[PDB]
Amino acid sequence: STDASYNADIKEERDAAEGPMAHGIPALNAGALDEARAYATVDSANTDEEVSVAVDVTNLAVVAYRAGSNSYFHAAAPGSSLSHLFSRSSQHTLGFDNTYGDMAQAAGSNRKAIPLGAAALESGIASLNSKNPLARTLMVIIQMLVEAARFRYIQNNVDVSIETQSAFAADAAMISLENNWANLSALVQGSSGGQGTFASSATLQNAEDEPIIVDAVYHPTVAAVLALMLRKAC
């Protein structure tokens, strides 16, 4: 239950799944990944009820998770992923993917209507070790662990939380950033001939719910926030 422990945590996640940067912001490895290195395993313990996450190091997606003697792969999991993930376990398959639009449909709620912080993934892991209606615990886990490594801003949201010692939900700030992770990248890689200027206006919201129309990379909301960028070009 510390910021440093948590800081170091996502740090080891940012510098373990990153190949040479572009505008100073690192980028995930491209198809140059063997199925024998496309999967990263992360552990997560609490009251000693721990899980294991199997993320894709090319795009940072959770392809399944272990529970002692049971693993649970998302519906969008390719075949070759079961034959070399948590094989020594009793495999299983879920009825949805790692998408939010999916896990949102499941839970019946969503990121904005979901509290985050220490007192959140604490029980998030419990539901997992146990079982069902864990859809939500995927919101307050993928977001607390994965969506915080790509943006320094969501880490400082999950960090300023442990700080102030309260709980909180994902505002329009983290959501816009989150769902614009594919565009941003594409727009920052496709934007090399226009030297620091995208082709459209990506809208991200500030903490005061003020819509922001980012046009270039010369904005703090880009160079300082983005920590890991998806690999797409032009």
């Binding site: 400082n156 934007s191 226009g194 200027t197 046009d215």
Partner: protein
């Protein structure tokens, strides 16, 4: 992937404009930001900033001043510009950079040498207004304005007090929100004295830029924003060099 079109802001949020419209030899001025056709600049793949069909050339009626011109009647060297994260917009061949003598509307824009001043800081992007954010630093302490906005150390974040709020202008200058007149200044850095707030004189010492390394660098001296040690609640902040200290790390939570 070939050609994109945005805007170019600068000194005190004033936009880079083309005297009315004209063509060939029309000087560039500092005009209030609007969605005008003579306000939009097309950043291209060969590095030529073009506007109303013409490229942005460096003239020399003796001196050197930005201006538009036929991209075919102008010599390459005079049509290729280079924009960097530091906020500079240079012309590699001449080695001269885009600068704004005075922060006044309709004021002619001139090209000079790299002083790394705030009078030479720009920001290409459609969003031109000042980005009001919250700068967080060492030990999750926020940046506030000690005493009457004339000194600033760190203090706990209240999460709603304008004393710790800051405005980021397109000229790469950190200014106060309830007084966008004075802004982050340096000092005689040669010997850790202290950073505070004076009126925005536009020197190469009031210009900061948030780099991807996680810190705030000041182009002029390539130093970064640091603390005297840890004392943050009644002490001071200094300018020190690349020591990879976790204390030199800051994040603008917007």
């Amino acid at each position: 992937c070939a050609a994109a079109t945005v805007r170019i802001a600068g000194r005190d949020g004033f936009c880079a404009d083309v005297n009315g419209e004209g063509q060939n030899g029309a000087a560039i001025i500092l005009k209030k930001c609007a969605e005008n056709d003579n306000q939009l600049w097309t950043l291209k793949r060969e590095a030529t900033i073009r506007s109303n069909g013409g490229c942005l050339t460096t003239a020399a009626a003796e001196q050197a001043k930005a201006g538009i011109y036929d991209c075919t009647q102008a010599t390459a060297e005079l049509s290729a510009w280079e924009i960097a994260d530091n906020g500079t917009i240079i012309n590699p061949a001449s080695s001269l950079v885009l600068s704004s003598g005075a922060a006044n509307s309709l004021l002619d824009l001139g090209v000079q040498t790299n002083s790394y001043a705030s009078a030479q800081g720009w920001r290409t992007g459609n969003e031109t207004s000042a980005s009001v954010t919250q700068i967080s630093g060492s030990a999750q302490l926020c940046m506030q304005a000690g005493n009457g906005p004339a000194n600033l150390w760190m203090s706990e974040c209240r999460a709603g007090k304008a004393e710790q709020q800051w405005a980021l202008l397109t000229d790469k200058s950190i200014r106060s929100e309830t007084n966008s007149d004075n802004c982050l200044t340096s000092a005689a850095d040669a010997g850790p004295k202290t950073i505070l707030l004076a009126l925005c004189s536009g020197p190469a010492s009031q210009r900061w830029v948030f780099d991807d390394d996680g810190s705030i660098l000041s182009l002029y001296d390539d130093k970064q924003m640091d603390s005297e040690g840890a004392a943050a609640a009644a002490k001071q902040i200094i300018l020190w060099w690349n020591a990879a200290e976790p204390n030199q790390i800051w994040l603008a939570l917007f």
